[PDB]
Amino acid sequence: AFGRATHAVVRALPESLGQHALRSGEEVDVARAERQHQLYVGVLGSKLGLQVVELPADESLPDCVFVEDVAVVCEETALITRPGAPSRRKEVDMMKEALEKLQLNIVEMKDENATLDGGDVLFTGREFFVGLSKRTNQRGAEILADTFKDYAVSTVPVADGLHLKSFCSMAGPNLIAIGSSESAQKALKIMQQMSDHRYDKLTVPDDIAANCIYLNIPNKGHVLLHRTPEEYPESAKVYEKLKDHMLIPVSMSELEKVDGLLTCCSVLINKK
Numbered sequence: 124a125f126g127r128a129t130h131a132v133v134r135a136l137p138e139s140l141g142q143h144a145l146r147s148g149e150e151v152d153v154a155r156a157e158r159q160h161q162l163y164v165g166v167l168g169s170k171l172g173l174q175v176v177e178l179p180a181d182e183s184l185p186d187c188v189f190v191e192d193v194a195v196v197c198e199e200t201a202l203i204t205r206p207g208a209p210s211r212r213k214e215v216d217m218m219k220e221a222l223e224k225l226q227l228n229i230v231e232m233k234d235e236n237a238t239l240d241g242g243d244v245l246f247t248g249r250e251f252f253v254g255l256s257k258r259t260n261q262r263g264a265e266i267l268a269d270t271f272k273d274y275a276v277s278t279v280p281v282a283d284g285l286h287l288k289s290f291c292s293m294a295g296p297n298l299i300a301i302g303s304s305e306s307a308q309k310a311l312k313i314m315q316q317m318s319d320h321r322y323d324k325l326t327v328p329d330d331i332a333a334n335c336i337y338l339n340i341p342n343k344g345h346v347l348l349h350r351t352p353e354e355y356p357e358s359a360k361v362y363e364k365l366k367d368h369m370l371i372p373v374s375m376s377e378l379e380k381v382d383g384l385l386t387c388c389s390v391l392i393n394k395k
């Protein structure tokens with residue numbers, strides 16, 4: 124019933140990430156990013172009971188750590204994306220291998236005109252929302268709908284160099300964690316006109332902290348992976364009011380420099 128998952132698929136980050144990972148100041152501490160990453164990996168694996176499929180790092184692919192961009196998974200059908208950046212399209216080769224070893228329904232985005240980034244796809248359990256930016260185009264959302272037939276797909280424009288989940292994420296069933304800046308409050312109002320259902324809102328002052336990770340572990344509660352108070356204290360105050368969720372402060376300050384967030388580093392899978 125939304126949020127249930129049994130497997131997580133991640134990928135180690137390479138040394139190429141420090142100097143050659145795409146971004147939109149301050150250099151990246153490669154050692155710290157991989158310390159924050161394994162702790163991130165430890166929470167999905169040894170903490171929340173999921174088994175984490177760790178994928179080896181490819182030094183020719185600086186952004187290989189952000190596996191969400193190359194796969195959108197729903198129920199028993201996984202969509203292999205064609206990323207917006209041509210240099211990221213080879214990240215999908217090992218992604219397809221691993222997801223196959225899990226025996227999912229594999230739909231590859233092969234249209235030479237299709238580009239879709241997994242960070243631009245916000246799935247609410249009832250329908251999809253696809254950000255329209257330079258990474259995800261119109262037709263790129265049209266294979267997403269063609270892939271997942273039983274869900275409505277509505278597209279929302281994303282300005283600047285952002286993804287859709289750069290300022291928003293699901294913090295619960297029918298609950299949408301939203302940022303407070305002007306671009307997020309604009310994309311949120313647009314999405315609620317297309318949906319015939321009324322969604323809830325968890326407004327946080329920091330757009331980066333609006334990207335969380337919601338999980339539903341049976342008899343364990345509703346788990347929320349949010350940004351630590353050291354990273355964003357004003358936004359961690361909001362998540363602290365949720366006394367009925369298992370709150371876990373996860374740090375991602377290094378990978379945030381290359382526009383990498385909590386959601387983008389793992390592909391969550393329910394296999395039953």
Ligand SMILES: *c1ccnc(CSC[C@H](N)C(=O)O)c1
Nearest residue numbers: 145189242286381382384387
């Ligand atoms: C998660 C949330 C928002 N944006 C992303 C893409 S970052 C990966 C790479 N640096 C890039 O293509 O910008 C992931």
